Amino acid sequence: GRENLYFQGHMDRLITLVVSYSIAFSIFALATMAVVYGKWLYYFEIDFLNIPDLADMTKDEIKRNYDVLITYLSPFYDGALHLPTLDMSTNGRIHFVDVKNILVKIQYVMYATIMIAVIGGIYLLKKKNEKFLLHGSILTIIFPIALMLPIAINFEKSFVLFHKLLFSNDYWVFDPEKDPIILMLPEEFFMHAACAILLFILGGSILCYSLYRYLVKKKRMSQK
Ligand SMILES: CCCCCCCC/C=C\CCCCCCCC(=O)OC[C@H](O)CO
Ligand SMILES: CCCCCCCC/C=C\CCCCCCCC(=O)OC[C@H](O)CO
Ligand SMILES: CCCCCCCC/C=C\CCCCCCCC(=O)OC[C@H](O)CO
Ligand SMILES: CCCCCCCC/C=C\CCCCCCCC(=O)OC[C@H](O)CO
Ligand SMILES: CCCCCCCC/C=C\CCCCCCCC(=O)OC[C@H](O)CO
């Protein structure tokens, strides 16, 4: 009676897979947005990395320019980028537009994946299937560990290839005399920022496994 069973139960396995990656991407996307728009890390870094001596600016000047930049990167802001006290080139202006376009598009996919995760997740949970949580947690821990290595071994070369991968021009190659903002965006900050994203993704993996372990515990205790 098993002979007709090779062709069976394909649909729900697909939904779990789609939901698994949507949760994965959603966590990655939320982690990125948390770091890009959260000013606590950079505010800490101004003093810790001594950015005032790197940039030859005061602590409030650095915050003023950084605030204007982060506001510009918001999807709800439609004006152009105009730094309060720093010079900027045409190509530099074009680079920050590219950055904003990346952030907007990631947010758009993120909205789709969050709704696939929620709707697909309610469907599977109402089937008493909490497996998308396990698979989702697996993807969220493999991804940061896999990228930990290029950050640790050679962060600087990873930075250049990351840029060569995401951007289609060389405008990301800032000249401090034409785009002085680069002085107050030191590479060590980007490394802390990159490490911050992975930690949030890692934290997301913990939260998913923990909810998976809770639901499994409920069914086995439901037996008892
Ligand atoms: C189970 C999945 C868990 C997902 C959690 C993975 C880690 C992501 C961290 C935070 C996400 C929620 C925080 C809100 C996300 C957007 C943050 C933001 O927009 O920053 C605004 C800024 O604080 C204004 O100054
Ligand atoms: C339509 C259905 C959607 C359902 C799913 C929605 C869940 C939203 C979760 C996080 C929002 C993250 C959005 C990131 C936008 C950040 C904007 C921002 O924080 O602006 C900061 C400002 O620039 C500082 O001055
Ligand atoms: C239509 C859907 C097409 C898009 C498909 C999904 C989007 C994933 C793309 C890139 C992920 C990389 C995430 C990196 C987010 C931050 C990168 C960044 O902004 O770089 C800053 C740098 O300092 C500037 O020079
Ligand atoms: C203090 C330095 C911080 C860096 C280290 C932070 C901890 C790493 C996060 C999770 C590891 C495992 C703990 C919880 C398990 C969740 C990860 C997971 O999804 O593992 C699934 C596994 O396959 C099912 O056995
Ligand atoms: C190791 C390869 C990946 C390394 C990259 C991961 C870190 C980027 C993520 C968040 C940055 C948050 C700060 C956002 C500040 C604006 C980004 C920006 O436009 O920076 C200009 C750039 O430095 C012109 O070269």
Author numbering: -9 to 214
Task: Reproduce the article's own wording on this structure.
Here, we report the crystal structure of the Lit enzyme from Bacillus cereus and describe its mechanism of action. Lit consists of four transmembrane helices with an extracellular cap. Conserved residues map to the cap-membrane interface. They include two catalytic histidines that function to effect unimolecular transacylation. The reaction involves acyl transfer from the sn-2 position of the glyceryl moiety to the amino group on the N-terminal cysteine of the substrate via an 8-membered ring intermediate.
Two structures were solved; one at 2.27 Å, the other at 1.95 Å. Here, we focus on molecule B (MolB) in the 1.95 Å structure, which has the better quality electron density. The protein assumes the shape of a truncated cone that spans the membrane with four transmembrane helices (M1–M4). Notably, two structured monoolein molecules that derive from the crystallisation process reside with their glyceryl head groups coordinated with the two conserved histidines. The sn-2 hydroxyl of MO1 coordinates with His85. The sn-3 hydroxyl of MO2 coordinates with His85 and His153. In MolB of the asymmetric unit, the chains run parallel to one another below the apolar surface of amphiphilic H4. In the apo form of Lit, M3 is bent midway along its length between Pro134 and Pro140.
